[PDB]
Amino acid sequence: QSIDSGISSLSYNRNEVLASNGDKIESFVPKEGKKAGNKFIVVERQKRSLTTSPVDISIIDSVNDRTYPGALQLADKAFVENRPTILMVKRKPININIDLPGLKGENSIKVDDPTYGKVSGAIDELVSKWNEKYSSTHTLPARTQYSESMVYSKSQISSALWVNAKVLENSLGVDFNAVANNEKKVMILAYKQIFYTVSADLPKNPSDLFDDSVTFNDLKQKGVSNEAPPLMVSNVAYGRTIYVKLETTSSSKDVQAAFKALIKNTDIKNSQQYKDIYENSSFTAVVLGGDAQEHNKVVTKDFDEIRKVIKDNATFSTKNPAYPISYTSVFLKDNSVAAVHNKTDYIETTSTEYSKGKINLDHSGAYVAQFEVAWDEVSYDKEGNEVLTHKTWDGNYQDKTAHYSTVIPLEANARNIRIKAREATGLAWEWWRDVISEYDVPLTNNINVSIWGTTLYPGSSITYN
Numbered sequence: 001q002s003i004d005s006g007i008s009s010l011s012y013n014r015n016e017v018l019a020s021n022g023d024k025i026e027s028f029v030p031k032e033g034k035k036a037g038n039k040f041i042v043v044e045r046q047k048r049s050l051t052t053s054p055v056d057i058s059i060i061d062s063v064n065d066r067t068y069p070g071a072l073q074l075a076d077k078a079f080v081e082n083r084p085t086i087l088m089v090k091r092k093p094i095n096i097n098i099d100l101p102g103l104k105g106e107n108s109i110k111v112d113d114p115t116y117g118k119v120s121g122a123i124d125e126l127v128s129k130w131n132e133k134y135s136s137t138h139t140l141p142a143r144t145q146y147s148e149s150m151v152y153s154k155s156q157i158s159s160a161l162w163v164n165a166k167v168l169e170n171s172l173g174v175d176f177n178a179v180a181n182n183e184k185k186v187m188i189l190a191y192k193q194i195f196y197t198v199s200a201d202l203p204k205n206p207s208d209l210f211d212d213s214v215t216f217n218d219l220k221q222k223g224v225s226n227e228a229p230p231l232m233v234s235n236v237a238y239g240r241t242i243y244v245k246l247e248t249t250s251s252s253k254d255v256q257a258a259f260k261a262l263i264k265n266t267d268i269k270n271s272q273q274y275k276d277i278y279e280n281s282s283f284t285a286v287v288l289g290g291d292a293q294e295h296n297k298v299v300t301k302d303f304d305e306i307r308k309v310i311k312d313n314a315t316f317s318t319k320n321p322a323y324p325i326s327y328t329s330v331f332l333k334d335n336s337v338a339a340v341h342n343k344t345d346y347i348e349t350t351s352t353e354y355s356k357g358k359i360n361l362d363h364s365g366a367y368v369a370q371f372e373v374a375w376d377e378v379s380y381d382k383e384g385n386e387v388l389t390h391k392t393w394d395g396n397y398q399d400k401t402a403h404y405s406t407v408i409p410l411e412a413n414a415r416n417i418r419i420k421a422r423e424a425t426g427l428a429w430e431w432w433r434d435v436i437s438e439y440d441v442p443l444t445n446n447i448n449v450s451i452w453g454t455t456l457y458p459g460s461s462i463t464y465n
Contacts, residue, residue, distance in 0.1 A: 006216030022344030030384030040354040040412030069200035070114035071233035090211035095201035142193035151186040153346035195239040238322035240289025251351040285309040290323035363404040368424035417441035436460035
């Protein structure tokens with residue numbers, strides 16, 4: 001069999017062949033009530049399905065040797081796992097092209113036997129060709145691309161940020177369990193820094209890559225199949241990537257809010273509300289490419305340190321070598337761009353915080369009073385529905401004389417608070433003057449009910465803390 005015939009005799013789905021089948025969901029409860037120390041956490045849970053189709057694949061800085069312009073790879077199940085099967089055979093010369101500024105021009109060069117070694121040489125030689133014409137200026141700005149996402153699933157954040165889950169896991173330390181138990185609220189940003197790209201001139205036919213001596217039965221033996229179709233690395237982004245982790249123990253609906261407020265440094269990042277969230281928040285910044293040394297990290301409570309990390313890696317130097325961040329590939333058959341089809345189901349967890357309170361009753365009046373304190377306690381059934389539990393203060397409908405002071409403590413799941421004080425000038429409770437009559441009292445920390453005055457001129461005030 002021929003090479004150009006062989007490669008065409010391949011019946012594979014150009015779409016489904018490079019596809020990640022991100023895990024199918026674990027059974028969730030739509031709503032969950034959870035008491036966790038002076039706090040009642042209400043978590044709502046929704047199943048979400050995301051379908052991404054990136055044409056850009058990231059490279060694990062460990063196996064960077066297998067990815068370069070003109071490289072030959074396989075569209076096998078190992079490709080989606082960012083560790084591809086290489087294809088080293090005898091090659092016909094292939095042309096590469098740098099996209100560095102102010103180059104019309106000589107930006108293009110010919111490589112005789114495309115191998116990582118001489119291809120790196122050709123990229124280096126092309127860079128020499130730029131930094132000789134621009135002998136004076138060595139520092140250029142990086143072409144920064146910014147991504148930002150809330151973390152729910154290991155599978156989701158990987159599908160969200162087109163970054164290998166393990167990379168993200170190891171380099172940042174995403175506690176995916178705390179995240180899955182709504183014990184931690186995690187946001188990860190990704191400042192993708194591109195120095196330049198090296199493009200490798202596409203062939204007219206599959207044969208234009210392979211030296212004539214090479215046959216389809218050698219490639220067939222080398223792993224080429226309908227299951228592992230051949231690929232060519234058409235483009236490679238060279239540079240670094242700063243990843244930033246924003247961690248909090250809070251369940252306050254305004255985390256994403258305080259986090260965005262903080263990254264953008266918008267005036268609101270100063271208000272009291274966002275302040276308690278920053279008190280339980282750690283910021284981690286890691287850089288991955290070439291320049292910063294392996295296992296570098298910033299772990300801070302002051303976002304200004306992180307801010308420094310980004311402004312520092314926003315400029316690259318033309319004399320220092322660049323390392324491959326991501327890459328485009330093409331199927332040898334249609335010369336069409338190979339894309340990864342990312343299916344992923346995940347649970348989108350939303351949460352709210354509630355902190356306990358207490359009604360403080362204070363009778364001081366020149367009369368007898370009677371109280372009618374009552375509220376509900378919210379619980380959630382297995383189907384997610386709200387279940388009300390009617391509670392009443394034990395001292396309800398019993399005579400109180402000046403001076404009487406008490407506390408009616410309320411559990412953070414308390415709703416429907418009613419405080420009522422009636423005045424004993426009358427036959428029985430049913431027909432007594434209200435001194436205070438309050439409905440749907442908002443659960444504070446302190447609900448201060450004070451009844452004072454005279455049996456004819458009584459006073460009442462409902463104050464909060």
